[PDB]
Amino acid sequence: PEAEALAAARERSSRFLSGLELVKQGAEARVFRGRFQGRAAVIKHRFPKGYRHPALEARLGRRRTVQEARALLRCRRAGISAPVVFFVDYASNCLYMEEIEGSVTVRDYIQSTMETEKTPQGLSNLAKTIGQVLARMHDEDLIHGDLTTSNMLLKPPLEQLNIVLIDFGLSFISALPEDKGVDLYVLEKAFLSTHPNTETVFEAFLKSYSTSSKKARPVLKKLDEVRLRGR
Amino acid sequence: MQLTHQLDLFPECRVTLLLFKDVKNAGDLRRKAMEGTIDGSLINPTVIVDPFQILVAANKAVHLYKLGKMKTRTLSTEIIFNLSPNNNISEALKKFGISANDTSILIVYIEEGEKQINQEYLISQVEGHQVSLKNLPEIMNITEVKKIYKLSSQEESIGTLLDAIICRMSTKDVL
Ligand SMILES: Nc1ncnc2c1ncn2[C@@H]1O[C@H](COP(=O)(O)OP(=O)(O)NP(=O)(O)O)[C@@H](O)[C@H]1O
Ligand SMILES: [Mg+2]
Ligand SMILES: [Mg+2]
């Protein structure tokens, strides 16, 4: 790749990204929002930090971006609701995807539902639905890699419990029940230290997961293993 | 009449769509595109379900053209290849390009800066009737789309056909 050409693509992509509404400046990536040929879009830029070997740095941005692109395709084909991929710029490591307009993360719905209800029992229907989504996801052998409540959105109308998974930079394919239980254990940890006193709700998700996945029994046994081993 | 959109990521580039029905000189236009005597990309309008489709394909084409990293020989062929769900170049130019018997053709070209394309001369070259792009639904055949992209029941259950189409186009270079 001609150096001058590549650098031009990079400065073209940041010129565009500048000016956009910054949505989240995260650890490894910036998320902006805007329009892409007429559609509402979110752009995830895995920016280089300069604090490391630029070869290692670019390799990392690239692999994350390729992992997410590949997973988002595999989700769509397998009936697992996640954002549509518009365009992936590999010269800069930017993922252009459909914005889930008006979405709320599942974390925010949980915290706002436990400050008015004062009880987690109103969350059970949420729990059941998430069991269905992750069930189908795991049954096509897709591991999310970072199941948290911030990586699930709720698509308006919020109360219908329409879940959209996001952040697939660490996703991958595996039929290994241990890998699936690790996926669930990452979620359980996430619950533990984000939404206190939600243990009832994780078990509710687990029951519905058990019911909607017929490959669940080995997964849950390995999850007990992972809980014990802690890894 | 025509339909034209600026490219968001390449703001000096216009993408123009022209649609024609009752096209008599189909095979002739085909050979004129192989020759390099006609401007733009001649596309099978019956498997385009929306201008957004053409625009995603045109955007990726211009991106790799500027990087000198296209898969096909020219910008005009790259636009058509990006429409394909798979990476087989020849199947893609054959399927999403125009057949000798086509009576509908879509012309897509890309202008950059002020270097214009003789639109009048290009319309001048087609023995058919330039219809509004708004008539594209009449010519698009959902059956053939669902067949050439191989779109699931599972995909239809969580979005549009356009959405599944875009998702395959946008990620085939890594699958
Ligand atoms: N497709 C989308 N539609 C709408 N909002 C989105 C979309 N993708 C991301 N967001 C929002 O932007 C945030 C960033 O998403 P994410 O994919 O988790 O990037 P990230 O690298 O994990 N940033 P961070 O979660 O802070 O580490 C999400 O938590 C949402 O609030
Ligand atoms: Mg995240
Ligand atoms: Mg991330």
Numbering used by the authors:
A (entry chain C): 17 to 247
B (entry chain B): 1 to 175
Show me the paper's own sentences about this structure:
The p53-related protein kinase (PRPK, TP53RK) was initially cloned and described as a p53 interacting protein being able to phosphorylate p53 at Ser151. Its binding partner, Cgi121 (TPRKB, TP53RK-binding protein), was identified by the same group through a yeast two-hybrid screen.
PRPK roughly adopts a kinase domain that splits into the N-lobe and the C-lobe. The C-lobe is considerably smaller than a typical kinase. TPRKB uses helices α2, α8, and α9 from one side of the β-sheet and the loop between β1-β2 to interact with the N-lobe of PRPK. In PRPK, the exact 183DFG185 plays the same role, with the D183 sidechain carboxy oxygens in close proximity to both Mg2+ ions (within 2.8 Å). F184 of the DFG loop reaches into a pocket formed by L88 and H160, adopting a so-called DFG-in conformation, which helps maintain the D183 sidechain in a position capable of coordinating magnesium. Collectively, both spines in PRPK are well assembled, suggesting an active conformation.
